[PDB]
């Protein structure tokens, strides 16, 4: 009996806000400032040497 | 010179207001951006063409007296 179960169709789509978006989120927080500090500074530069370069 | 720099940086405003469209328009924290960025952008560009206006009459009250005086004198 539980093999002839069968699936409703779910909604299409929930609501999209016309005004927040990943990259220019709507409301602020420290967390988008993080991520836009460090594609500034870019990521960790790390050396492949065994010395130092001063 | 001047007032090209002072238009450009006014337009930089405009960019910056475009740029950030969403969160001036919807949020409301900054509403009151919303509501007077274009009372001080025209009072900026008044200044800026206040100013072009202004110099350009007095440029041209002195071109004609300079060629009417001189005329006299002859
Ligand atoms: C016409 C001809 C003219 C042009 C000719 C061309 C010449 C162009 C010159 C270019 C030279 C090549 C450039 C190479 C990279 C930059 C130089 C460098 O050393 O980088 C490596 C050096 C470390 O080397 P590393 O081995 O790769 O790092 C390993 C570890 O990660 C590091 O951390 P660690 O702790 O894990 O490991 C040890 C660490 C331990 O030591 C340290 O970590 C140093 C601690 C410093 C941080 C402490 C907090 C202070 C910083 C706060 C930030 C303030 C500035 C920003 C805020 C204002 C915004 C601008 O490093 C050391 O071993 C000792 C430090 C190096 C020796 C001392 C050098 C002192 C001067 C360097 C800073 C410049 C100061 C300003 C001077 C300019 C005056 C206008 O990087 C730095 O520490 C900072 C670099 C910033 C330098 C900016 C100035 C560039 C101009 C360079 C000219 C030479 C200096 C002239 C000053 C003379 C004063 C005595
Ligand atoms: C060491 C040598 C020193 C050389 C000095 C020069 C240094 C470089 C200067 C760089 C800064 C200037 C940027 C110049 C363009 C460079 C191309 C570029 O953006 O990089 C590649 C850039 C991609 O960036 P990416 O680095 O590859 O990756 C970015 C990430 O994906 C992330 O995506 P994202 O979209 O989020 O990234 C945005 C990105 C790129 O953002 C952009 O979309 C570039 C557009 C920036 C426009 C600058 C304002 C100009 C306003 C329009 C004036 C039009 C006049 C003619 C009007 C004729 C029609 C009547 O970054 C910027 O927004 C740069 C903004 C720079 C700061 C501007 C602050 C102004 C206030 C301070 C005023 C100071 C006085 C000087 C002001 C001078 C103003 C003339 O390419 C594009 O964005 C393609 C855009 C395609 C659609 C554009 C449609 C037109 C948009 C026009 C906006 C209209 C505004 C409202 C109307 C205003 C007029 C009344």
Redesign the pocket.
């Known amino acids: 009996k539980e093999n002839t179960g069968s699936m409703k169709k779910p909604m299409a789509k929930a609501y999209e806000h016309p005004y927040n978006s990943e990259h220019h989120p709507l409301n602020f927080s420290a967390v988008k400032i993080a991520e836009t500090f460090h594609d500034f500074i870019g990521p960790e530069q790390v ?1 492949p040497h065994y010395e ?3 | 010179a001047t007032a090209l720099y002072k238009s450009s940086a006014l337009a930089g405003n405009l960019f910056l207001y475009a740029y950030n469209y969403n969160n001036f328009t919807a949020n409301i924290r900054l509403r009151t951006m919303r509501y007077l960025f274009p009372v001080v952008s025209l009072a900026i560009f008044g200044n800026i063409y206040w100013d072009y206006r202004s110099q350009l009459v007095k440029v041209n009250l002195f071109d004609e007296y300079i060629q009417a005086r001189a005329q006299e004198l002859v």
């Open positions: 050396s130092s370069f001063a």
